[PDB]
Amino acid sequence: SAVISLDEFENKTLDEIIGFYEAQVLKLFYAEYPSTRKLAQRLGVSHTAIANKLKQYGIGK
Fold first, then answer.
1. Structural domain range at position 23
2. Which of 8, 29, 56, 60 has the maximum number of C-beta atoms within 10 A of its C-beta?
3. Alpha helices of 1-61 — where are they, by DSSP H?
4. Exposed, middle or buried by CB within 10 Å (0-12, 13-18, 19+), for 54?
């Protein structure tokens, strides 16, 4: 599919591959990485930024 994974998602700052694959990546980061705060720690991001992105996707809260 793409060039990432739950063990290699700390390379892109939630943008080099987000959008559609996100629904399964963001809904997944939130399923694998609980608490957007600790979730942003693996996805290398400013947390709130990571949340807002998939917050409108139907996740986050």
1. 1-61
2. 29
3. 20-32, 36-42, 48-55
4. buried
One-letter amino acid of 15: D
> Would you say 26 and 7 are in contact if contact means Cβ atoms under 8 Å apart?
no
Rounded CA-CA distance 21/23 in Å is 6
Report the CATH number at residue 61.
Answer: 1.10.10.60
Helix, strand, coil tally for the chain in percent (to 5): 45, 0, 55
- How was this structure determined? It was done by NMR
What single letter denotes the amino acid at residue 21?
Y
Cβ atoms 36, 60 nearer than 8 A: yes
- Please tell me the total number of residues recorded for the chain in this structure: 61
Q: How many domains in the chain? A: 1
